[PDB]
Amino acid sequence: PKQTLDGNTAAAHVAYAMSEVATIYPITPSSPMAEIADEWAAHGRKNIFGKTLQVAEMQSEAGAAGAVHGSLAAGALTTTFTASQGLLLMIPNMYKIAGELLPCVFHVAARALSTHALSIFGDHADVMAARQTGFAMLSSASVQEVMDLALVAHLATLKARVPFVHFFDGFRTSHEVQKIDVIEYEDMAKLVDWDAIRAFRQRALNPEHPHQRGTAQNPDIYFQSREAANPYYLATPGIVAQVMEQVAGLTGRHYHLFDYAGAPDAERVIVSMGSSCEVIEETVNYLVEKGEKVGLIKVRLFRPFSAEHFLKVLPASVKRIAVLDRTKEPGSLGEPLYEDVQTVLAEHGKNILVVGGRYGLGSKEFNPSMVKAVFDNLAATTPKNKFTVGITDDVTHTSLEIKEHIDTSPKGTFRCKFFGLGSDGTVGANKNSIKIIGDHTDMYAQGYFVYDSKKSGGVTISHLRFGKQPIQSAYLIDQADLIACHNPSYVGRYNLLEGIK
Amino acid sequence: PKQTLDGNTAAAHVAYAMSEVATIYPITPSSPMAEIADEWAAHGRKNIFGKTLQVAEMQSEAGAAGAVHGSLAAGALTTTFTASQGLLLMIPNMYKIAGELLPCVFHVAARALSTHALSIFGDHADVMAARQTGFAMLSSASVQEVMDLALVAHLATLKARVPFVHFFDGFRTSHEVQKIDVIEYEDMAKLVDWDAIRAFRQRALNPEHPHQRGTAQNPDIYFQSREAANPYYLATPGIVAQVMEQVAGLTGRHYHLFDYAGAPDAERVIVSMGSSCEVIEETVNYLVEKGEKVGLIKVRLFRPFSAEHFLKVLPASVKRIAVLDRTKEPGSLGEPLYEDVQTVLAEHGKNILVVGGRYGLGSKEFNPSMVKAVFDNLAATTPKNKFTVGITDDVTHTSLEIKEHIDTSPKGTFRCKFFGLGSDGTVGANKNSIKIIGDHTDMYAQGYFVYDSKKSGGVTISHLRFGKQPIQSAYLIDQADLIACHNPSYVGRYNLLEGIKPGGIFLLNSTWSAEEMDSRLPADMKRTIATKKLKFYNIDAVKIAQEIGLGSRINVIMQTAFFKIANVIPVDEAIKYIKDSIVKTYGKKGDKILNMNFAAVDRALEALEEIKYPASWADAVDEAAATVTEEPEFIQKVLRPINALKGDELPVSTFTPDGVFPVGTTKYEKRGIAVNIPQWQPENCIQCNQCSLVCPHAAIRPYLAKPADLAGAPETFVTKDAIGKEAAGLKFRIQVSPLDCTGCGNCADVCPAKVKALTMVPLEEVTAVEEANYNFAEQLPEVKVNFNPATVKGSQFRQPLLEFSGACAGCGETPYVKLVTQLFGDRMIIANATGCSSIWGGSAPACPYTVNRQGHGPAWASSLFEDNAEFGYGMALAVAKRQDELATAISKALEAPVSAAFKAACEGWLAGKDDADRSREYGDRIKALLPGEISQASGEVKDLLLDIDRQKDYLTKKSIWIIGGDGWAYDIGYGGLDHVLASGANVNVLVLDTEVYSNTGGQSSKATQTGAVARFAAGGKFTKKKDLGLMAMSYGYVYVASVAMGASHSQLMKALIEAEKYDGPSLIIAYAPCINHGINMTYSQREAKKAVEAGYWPLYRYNPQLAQEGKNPFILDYKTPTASFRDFLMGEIRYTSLKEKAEQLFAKAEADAKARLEQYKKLAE
Amino acid sequence: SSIWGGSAPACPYTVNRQGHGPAWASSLFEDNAEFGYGMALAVAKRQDELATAISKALEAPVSAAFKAACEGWLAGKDDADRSREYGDRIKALLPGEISQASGEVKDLLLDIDRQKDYLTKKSIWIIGGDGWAYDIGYGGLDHVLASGANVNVLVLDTEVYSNTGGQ
Ligand SMILES: CC(=O)c1sc(CCOP(=O)(O)OP(=O)(O)O)c(C)[n+]1Cc1cnc(C)nc1N
Ligand SMILES: CC(=O)c1sc(CCOP(=O)(O)OP(=O)(O)O)c(C)[n+]1Cc1cnc(C)nc1N
């Protein structure tokens, strides 16, 4: 059926169905996932095992991670929801969970890490800090993709014995409201490898067939024992590929480990991950229609990185690639995805000029005008490397210049902005209006809400979109068809009519 | 000046000079860094600021990291030392320290991370996990480089404002002893940028010039503000380069961001980091001299990675590069250093074939034969990529083939191996010998020491090298000029003479004469001695030590024998340095002890006899091997080769992919390390079974048998009639396991009979007799007995399910855990915290937890150090879920066409599934009817019964036990333990309180009492012991009890049974005597009795169930102490070493015991 | 308390007429107790550096009124009222004493002047919510309280995680 949900609810919907235990601890913007999971259990929602999910709150995410390990080692399918500083505290236990090959899915609303300052907003800094734990990592770019790929992870982790981190961009996706196709619990159970679940029960700690796990090992056997898990990681890409075909047969939506979009004879291709893929595909449609030979590679399965599946979707006409990372590793030669892309193309002797950039740190805006700038940098005589997009870096001169402002929104899409006052009901009303249009028309509906740091009396700006075509505009509204101001004080104070058509 | 130090001391030497505050927390192998820094402060060593370093120990590495951040933000130069799991907990704070641009240096003894299994040994896994925090990273390849680059890090961090991680290979460098040039503190201060230090003071938080830091930022400014620190990182490489030139001018030793070594026209180059660079340079010298065009790039500054400084040292003739990473990132396209090299060469259009490999994980050996294999792989037509070196990967075929063995050691280097016993003085003597040669000759000296997982009686192998050229051989000795064996039991057990050079020296400690050599030495050993024409020397050091009066200490005796034959220095000069060192070592001892050690040197020189063997020894033939017993595949293929010191030969296909091991494997060890074993006197025995209760290794147990079962018994299996109405008509015997006994002597001390029924007799005299006795007792059939398990005597008739562990002789921890397995081991799951209890409880490949005749026993798992409570808490949730899934399938069976007897047991199980006895009673009833009921069903009814049969392992109620040490419960895991207790879940927490961090050597804890001296507390702990039991009582629904087995057997029985039956959280804090207290382990049980009788340790039980019955929950089980408080303290070395200021601390300890007793009397009123 | 207390670009903490006021810092959620603990050690270290330079001034040729305030401060550096009293006496005599000195005496006085912002005893305050003190930071708060350091922990108990919506 069609419902209007956000990324958090889409993830919790699948996680609730596929899990018996969920140990949680609150952290923005992942706490809504655990909040709605608690309400569902209190109202008696059943999972695919016919029981309600048992939710246990710990004293910290470190305690949550330890509880997950114990619950998994004792024979219960367990998940958790976390982000940012919370994900860091779980990293020590993640090494154990991956090393012991326990099926598991962590759902992460990717959020910036506290460095020079705290930021509750979204980027991939937290997920990248765990890329060496041995967990698999799956990225969803839209609310619909959160629903589908969360199922992909839960099905694949049982088959591969490799735990998964399913992550989506904080706020930009976790709090983005969209009308999506919801997968029924009965349909999931038809795809589950029940043989894998029963095998997972036999490996559990039990006094009637006891075993020892987590021993201490000397140099004589530690190296070999660490390489004994090599077959499990080599087979994980093929398992994810086959699971993605199962979801394809059920939903009609085809995912691959790496997806390509754009001109088949493209010469400039952007490689990206997360919600940026939507903005880039929307821009690619606009540029390809304008005749430019550009393309986009969406990274779905980031770890383990399958070179075979990446090169299969890379056009032979590609001469220049720009890799965008939603993180910053100070002093590093490059960001994680840029180093991976540069490596695989080097291992296969591809004469492709690769350039890396950074974008969207702490939910910095990333709109189609910036995407064209990334493509324009690839078209320059000497493309700037190690760049930034979305800021003006007048100190180190890494920022790309936003030359012109373009409108790539598909024709027929309605766009509204609502300037409201803190807790006056505007946001709640817009949420209800999206549910109204989504339930009663064929139009796709999208809602995103800008909040203020002030707890009382702050300004709220709602961005709503409706159209006959799927809404890939994961960015603030550029040209609004309607602008509503619910507070007369804003007149003469803010540029309300900004960008109005 | 030249001193012999290890990497840890070299690092702490520089860190102490440059820092004002040092917040630390112990973790192997980094804890020696903080230990030596605390001692220097206790003796008043001044830093470059004219003050002593302030050392503060925190509750965890997370707390230490926060303290570093606060100390820096407030204006004090601060450092810390950590590694491995400890570094992981600091990662969140590292982002802040780097983000705020605070000068700082973390010293890391790089150690493996706990994945499928724990490893305390060295690799770069921990450092690589922090490569994105924004810290700089500096690598040291040798002990000398630790000294130099630590200074580079401390100097650069002030100039660049970017904090540094200075890391070196754990053990391979941190514990390698080398003679190095030590930099004087006065010379360092002449290089410090004092202007930079004063600028750091102005940025400090101060109310007279206040500022705000660590704000929360919205998307509008967060991206820009993060990029504002870019110039500081862009300038850091150049700053380190200039700082490296400063150290170069002072020391003459030239470092660069990346260093090159090898042929200038090389075509094959290895890029590496850490101690591997030493092995590679040594191999490169060997290959370049042979004409091969190879080279090596050493990475010093890993982050920030300067492409300019890397390409500057890459010869233009390089065509192929192999990058070696000392880490593993599963599923990644490549390891971190490989990805960096591949990236930078691509950014500059260099057409260079790059290949990456992994090596040395968890201190895996990495020797020159492997280095050539890496170089040979570059010479192949198609070089293998993503490879491994040092293992045989027969599953995924990533390992490189070690074709041939080469000797790249520089000519003139002497090489020695020393096989010793645990704590017999061998390692300490070799350390003294290295200091002697380094201080008195021009030779470089190196020492590396291989230890065992067994805590007592383990094998130690020392690797020493001396030469006229610098020693770059950062690997175990391959071809030894001299081999010494300090334990004759190793003869015929380990391959001692492996790789010994022709004409080398073999030194043996034994009582065997030249004629007995024909019959005592094995044929293969005699063949090697004769064919290689070895100079075989022998000495009876034990006879000498007995005659002199030194007991069995042979460290001085064997050290004298070494210098006499090694010909490393003049023999006359060596004798002087030994006696001079004896005064330094035994100067504080009595005058009688001094002359005894002098006589050891004199008598040893005349007693060392060379064995002139016949040339016919080369033709000796092995004796016919006996018919080998059919052992399990795991024992045959895994445990035996590992214990035979051949674990490195086991291929990848040997091990499970998830680090899961079988149980009950320590019964196959039979080490037989005891000097004395108890002999049972049947006529004095009252059949009390207390000896089986107190045995720290379960080597002594009572055996019952019907008189008919004693048919084929040997004549020495003397028995007595069984006392008690339950054992009427049965025979009784107290039998000891000779090969598993440790000789601790606790059982002889606890025997309360009028005449002692246990006397310690030497093993060799009774070994043949007692072996046949134990082998017969083990084959006795099971005996059903109705003794009450709630008594001491009745409980010991149940089979112990924790046996033959690696704990020390007389350990105070294992008797507690052994008792739990005898009461509830049939149905318990153990979540064990990292520590001693996890080392003797779970060191691969031996598992001390075993099963009974039915095959049931405790399932054991260890997660991490800080998460043990939540680890067991999650297990309880899952077990409850697994029982819930079974109860649903059983309730559906009630509506199914099944037997009426089946329904009766199912309804009975559903009503009592939460009771231990009732669930086992009705659960076993269901198990008996299951096979027949399935046979009588078909279709859907059979499927419903088959699902119940699939879950029959959850019928019996489980008992979750959370076992851990005092360091876990009082410090790092207290926040998690507090949460698990407050939840109210049916869990049982057992705190083995040793009042120290016992495994890591005995460091200070919150469980340490006032005035006790331990590591990190050289001057004694001022603050009193934290009362963990009192805080758990504040909830009111948490069962808390303080027990001590040595004090009261009946009090321990009552608290354990009450704690397990309580449907809620239970906390058992047990006093466990340990060797770190400095006491005779023979009287370990007696020491616990004196502790409670003197008011030092309280005995109480807080029962929440008594509150529901209207009674007082607090019961004080020992109200009036009868012994003297100060007299108990003087019986343990951990308090006498403080004596001065000691009398001030002793008065506080006695006053707190009276106030604690008076506080318990008010609660009991 | 960190959101209304430290959200850029607005700072609610201000200074008095003399320009002095609270310095505010936030590290992480779990480390706040140990964070302030490290600050206490550093300030103690900074006061020792100033007190050492003052002890050298006792042996230096300076005015008797300058020595009188220094002896009084050294006796009362650990009292809030006494350290501010004699500290301001040192501040008033510092500019004139530097004018009357030369050579090494001037450098010794300039070292006192460089550290005059540590004459007044500081008051370390550890501020946090109930979630920090009761949950994630309790293990660290337990340790800092057990150390005995002169720190002031203020637990603003709202009985919930107020900022994140009331958990
Ligand atoms: C094994 C290891 O790496 C140990 S054992 C131990 C303390 C054990 O003391 P405890 O009192 O808790 O138990 P006990 O040994 O019986 O006395 C530490 C700190 N470590 C190092 C360490 C540090 N920090 C973390 C997170 N994990 C580990 N393993
Ligand atoms: C801001 C943020 O991300 C907050 S504020 C907060 C609890 C605040 O409750 P408290 O009672 O301690 O104080 P109060 O707000 O005044 O009620 C949490 C859990 N978080 C998420 C979180 C989770 N885990 C970690 C390590 N850090 C953070 N910041």
Ligand code: SF4
């Ligand atoms: S001497 Fe010690 S190890 Fe041996 S049986 Fe007695 S208590 Fe056990």
Ligand code: SF4
């Ligand atoms: S302690 Fe002594 S009396 Fe008691 S069972 Fe053992 S040998 Fe017999």
Ligand code: SF4
């Ligand atoms: S607790 Fe003490 S006696 Fe027991 S094994 Fe550890 S170090 Fe040895």
Ligand SMILES: [Mg+2]
């Ligand atoms: Mg301990």
Ligand SMILES: [Mg+2]
């Ligand atoms: Mg609160």
